[model samples]
Target: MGHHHHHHHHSGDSPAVTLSAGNYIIYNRVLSPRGEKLALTYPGRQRTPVTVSPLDGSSEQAWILRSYDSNSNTWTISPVGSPNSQIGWGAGNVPVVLPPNNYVWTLTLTSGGYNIQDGKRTVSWSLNNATAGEEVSIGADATFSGRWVIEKV
Candidate 1:
């Protein structure tokens, strides 16, 4: 069976942060559906869909961002708070289903065995990002998404 994990590179106490195991996502940058200029960015508390595939040898997982870039003219999702995006639980290319704006990327780890940082950072499962909570260890997953559909396991 395959397992999932995440980590944090920074905390509420830290300043700037890059994508790591444990970090809080305060913002996201995306382009318009027309792929022209900037559209709108999704904040933390916003919710997105999580897609998992066990059919292949690859271990990549991602968020369904297709709707985000679609011309459906829909916006917003009911989030649980802040996803692993900011308070990450795993590691990998974290894929997004859609393109341009209105897309959400999945934060995860499909592989195992790696040296992620250590510490107890506050994290919760919400999109709007309200409150501080939870602590966890970091793991790896070889099954993350990339520019294209991950072909390897």
Candidate 2:
């Protein structure tokens, strides 16, 4: 008798996508049709608010993901060429660039895309609006606005 590899599940849960440490271009999967990508208002500047801009292959739009804790499955996301400045939660749940210390994020994968969450796992990155130049904020749930695609660069 031949062994069968049966892998069946009745749940509707989406499969997870693993993200390894590397350079990535993070964009809103829902907003991707409009060519919007995560960027900084002022690249390399501390406290620069995270915004959405049209993809142009700029360093400002590129992000670097580094493993922070394997056990906790956390990572630090920083802009290209600015390793010290990493994305963090700022006032009003806005995403901003801040000096890295304990700042870390979690990438929860779903069928749609990844949900970028803060170290506390309370909030997740979400688009304030579907327009470009709008800042990104954190939300309590990973809805359509919170789904992002991390493409390797």
Candidate 3:
């Protein structure tokens, strides 16, 4: 799984973030070939399952970050959030803080975008424009399910 690191920028300096966080924390980290690591953390959680929200700014694209339940191997979606993130998708499984290992991640982004970060630099891309089933190189971090483009169709 890809990962991202979230920073706590102080107010009147470089914007700001919620200092008082809730239970659990959610973060997205991405690894890249440039030898960089990024993190985006969201701190909060919900008791019940929430519907997948839409990423239209005015509204939210609810998500259910679930994994295969032991003895079931079935992906169970729920409205759970770890860390303090302004945006989230249901419940998050596992975590973005992963051990350094050689493995590949097929991030199935249904919506939102990824703010790619590495070293001391950062960039972003909308998952809506991502190639289907294509893997993107992330060295530091990648924030997912945060924003989605809503074009009038």
lDDT of 2: 0.72
Residues 21-41, candidate 1: write the lDDT tens digits: 221212111212333221112
- Arrange candidates, best lDDT first: 2, 3, 1
RMSD in Å for model 1? 19.0
lDDT, residue 132, model 2: 72
Q: Per-residue lDDT of 68-101 in model 3, one digit per residue for the tens?
A: 3323222322222321222212223222222222
Q: By summed lDDT, which 10 consecutive residues of candidate 3 come out lowest?
A: 18-27
Candidate 2 positional error at 87, Å: 1.5
Question: Which is the leading candidate under TM-score?
Answer: 2
lDDT of 3 at 89: 23
Every candidate's lDDT: 0.23, 0.72, 0.25
User: How close to the true structure is residue 49 of candidate 3, measured as C-alpha lDDT?
Assistant: 21
Q: How big is the positional error of residue 82 in model 1, measured in Å on the Cα after superposition? A: 27
- Taking all chains together, each candidate's TM-score versus the true structure is 0.15, 0.80, 0.18
